Amino acid sequence: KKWFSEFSIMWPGQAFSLKIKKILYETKSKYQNVLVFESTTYGKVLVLDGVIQLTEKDEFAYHEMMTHVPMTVSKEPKNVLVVGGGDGGIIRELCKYKSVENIDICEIDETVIEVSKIYFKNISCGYEDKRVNVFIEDASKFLENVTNTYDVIIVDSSDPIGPAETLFNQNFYEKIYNALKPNGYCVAQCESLWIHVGTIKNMIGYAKKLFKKVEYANISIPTYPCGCIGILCCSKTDTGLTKPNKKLESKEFADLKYYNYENHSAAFKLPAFLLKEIENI
């Protein structure tokens, strides 16, 4: 069997590999190279431009933490936007909240949605919910144009190389601020603390120009490089996102596999060297 290897100028000198059971699908979409393969030990794997987006084995860690952190802090979230997230894992976690009335997703690449609906049925199931509305367009444009404001925006983008290159700058954060309710929250996937701390500092400084309270949390996920990934956390009130306002007790949450009330606050307890780098921003 051959191995897939994740190599990138974004983390030089290191690489993670998974063994391939079977390649399932490859295409060059309008935006990205798309690869779906069944791995031998992590189930199916989605790859965009040679970078792992998810595997069936660990995706719940990332989709649960990114969704339930801001959604247990928002008191009565009615309108949620997902930026990127074509695979549908965030939407899947959002549909669990009976209270939500509308879930918009702006995903630039409809191939990713259609690929997820075919090959990742337990991730893309949320697309069946009549509350979900899909916009195929660059979130950088959508956020300039949208009329509605949201209670929560979840930026589930791929990396800065490729069509996500527009989601990693000061302008983008102003657009997010303006599209949120006066008490609304944004979480965004953010750089592994083991890799470019300079990037984390840059993003934090972007968010801090607008938001009252900017926190960084860390998630353990093994198929992202360095085995972890950050959440950049943006709040308009001084109270921030470290402390949930509700517990997930109803039947729709029974099945959760990573996220719980205590993990929520714990994700925000960072390594000493990280606190020192981001103390004077």
Ligand X SMILES: CSC[C@H]1O[C@@H](n2cnc3c(N)ncnc32)[C@H](O)[C@@H]1O
Taking CB under 6 A as the binding criterion, the range among 48-56, 105-113, 142-150, 180-188 that sits at the site for ligand JFQ is: 48-56
Q: Annotate 190-226 with b (16+ C-beta within 10 A) or e (fewer).
A: bbbbebebebbbbbbebbeebbebbbbbbbebebbbe
Using CA atoms of 12, 281, 138, 83 in order, give the dihedral in degrees to the nearest 10: 90
In the complex, the smallest distance separating the C-beta of residue 230 from ligand X, rounded to whole angstroms, is 16
97: Cβ contacts below 8 Å, ≥ 6 apart: 71, 77, 252
Residue 13 Rama label (left phi>0; alpha psi -120 to 50; beta): left
Query: Is there binding between residue 223 and ligand X (CB under 6 A)?
Result: no
**Residue 156 annotated as binding site:** yes
Q: How many residues bind ligand JFQ (CB under 6 A)?
A: 12
Q: How far apart are CA 182 and CA 66, in angstroms?
A: 21
5 binds, among a second copy, ligand X, ligand JFQ, none (CB under 5 to 8 A by kind): a second copy
Q: Please select the residue that binds ligand X; options are 18, 47, 91, 139, rule is CB under 6 A.
A: 139
Residues in 154-173 at the binding interface with ligand JFQ, rule: CB under 6 A: 156, 158-159
198 binds a second copy (CB under 8 A): no
Residue nearer to ligand JFQ on the CB measure, 159 or 215: 159
Q: Which residue number, 48 or 248, has a Cβ lying nearer to ligand JFQ?
A: 48
Residues 70 and 93: beta-carbon distance below 8 Å: no
Restricting to residues 58-97, name those near ligand X by CB under 6 A.
Answer: 83-87
Q: Which does 106 bind (CB under 5 to 8 A by kind): a second copy, ligand JFQ, ligand X, none?
A: ligand X
247 binds a second copy (CB under 8 A): no
Query: What SS3 class is residue 278?
Result: coil
User: Residue 199 contacts by C-beta under 8 Å, 6 or more apart in sequence?
Assistant: 191
Q: Is 156 a catalytic residue?
A: yes
- Please give the distance of CA 12 from its chain centroid, rounded to a whole number: 23
Q: Which of a second copy, ligand JFQ, ligand X, none sits in contact with 51, Cβ below 5 to 8 A by type?
A: ligand JFQ
Positions at the binding site: 156
Residues of this chain that interact with ligand X (CB under 6 A) are: 31, 48, 53, 83-87, 106-109, 112, 138-140, 156-158, 163-164, 166-167
Catalytic positions are 156
